Point group: C10
């Protein structure tokens, strides 16, 4: 089961990488849009937060799937 540790480790690493850069950029860019024009400022950042929920859904479910695949 030594390979399983790496499989999950790389999968999680991939999950962290994807959501990490996706959300990092999502926050800054969201912020940049708000700064450019003061139109629906709270709403734009709120959309950003839902984006965070959506993007992180993938790494969370990916980790769960990796766990189950290793388990069964």
């Amino acid at each position: 089961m030594h390979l399983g540790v790496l499989a999950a480790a790389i999968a999680v690493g991939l999950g962290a990488l994807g959501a990490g850069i996706g959300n990092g950029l999502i926050v800054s860019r969201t912020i940049e849009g708000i700064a450019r024009q003061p139109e629906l400022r709270p709403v734009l950042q709120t959309t950003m937060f839902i984006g965070v929920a959506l993007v992180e859904a993938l790494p969370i479910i990916g980790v769960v799937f990796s766990f189950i695949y290793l388990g069964r």
Copy 2:
């Protein structure tokens, strides 16, 4: 079947990575477009949501295919 765990783990990791960055950026950029000009604001974000459905279709189907390939 030890290799199968890694195959699915990396495939899912790839799926999470692609949709995660694609949707993260899709949300922020969508938001940025809305902020730049107050034209069809609800529609633009709605298009973003359909984009989410389209982009995540790929990781969902990819995971399913990986499962079946391992299974058969």
Copy 3:
């Protein structure tokens, strides 16, 4: 045929990654263009949809080819 599972799994992962980021960005950017100027708004998003068809053609055919290569 254990290697075949990984071959298809990584190929599909690659397919999901390419189209996922390509279409995710295509949707948001398409949206951003429409937001910037209200010129041919329906047409621009329509072009985006055909872009989706074009980009996903690659992962779909790639998956099919992977299946056949494994099969024969």
Copy 4:
């Protein structure tokens, strides 16, 4: 010939990835350019289509080469 399946699978995956992101971005950006200014709108999108033909030429020929290399 088990390695051959992976060789073609990864090559095609690479082909799908390159053209998929290249064309996805080509469509959205082409669209963005048209939206920014209403100058030679049909021509710009047409150039985009030829771009599609050019970019996909690479994955198509790559797949063919992979097939022949495996074959001979």
Copy 5:
């Protein structure tokens, strides 16, 4: 357990890579947005900081998961 060291090492490397580029860009872009327009300057940078917390949550949890997978 020699493979375990690499599994965690690459996972952490992936974690550092994702959050490192995500937060690096988040800080500069956040800064760029503030510079472009003097609207809600403290708030925009504050949003950036929460972005940092969100993005680094992934590498921190990823490292923890890698540790546990190696442990059990």
Copy 6:
């Protein structure tokens, strides 16, 4: 010579990837520049075409080199 097939397959995949994204983006961006300002429109797109010739020179020669290396 089983490894040779993969060597060429990955090299070509790399060639398709580099030129595919390079030319895809070159076409759309070239198009975007023309759209932004109606200055030397034919010339700008022409420069784009020479760019295509230059960028694809690399994958073409790379494939040839891979073939010869396998051959000798």
Copy 7:
């Protein structure tokens, strides 16, 4: 322990890569924001410096973790 050297070497390489590009871009973009508008110029660059501290925290801790994993 030969694999351990590579594990740390690649982890550090990953650490250098992530922070290197993250901070390189953070410095230039920070600079670009300041150049665009003369608003809170010292503060913006200062935020950039804290960004540097944050981003490099990841590679530093990653290297430390790699060392300990190899050690124990």
Copy 8:
């Protein structure tokens, strides 16, 4: 010497990838700059050409080095 073929094949693939995307983008962006403002148009594109010479110097020398390393 079977590994040597792959070493050169991947090195060349890397060379084609780097210069291919670097020059593809260099041509389009160069073009975009010229389009934005009609200032020193011939000179800007000329600088682009020297950029091509500089960027391709790397893949050319890399291929030569790979050949010699295999040879000796």
Copy 9:
């Protein structure tokens, strides 16, 4: 110790890659910011130089660490 050569070779390659693209972009973007507005031109480029020092610190230390890991 044959693996050690590759470990350092890839680590250095990673170091060169990260700082190379980080500093290459840092120089051009820094330059672009200065060109956009003639405000604190020497200072902006100077900040760029310190950025170079910061970014290259990572590859230099990474190479040193790789050397020591191989050594001990």
Copy 10:
């Protein structure tokens, strides 16, 4: 010493990739900045050239290090 050839080949490939894209983009972007505003045009491109010297310093030294590691 068969692995050594690949180690240097991939390291050089990495070196060419990093500097190739870094300098390719540095030239075009430098050019774009000059085109946007006619301020210190020779100086900006000159800064670009020093950027080239800085960025290529990394691949040159990386290749040298790879050679020595293989040698000793």
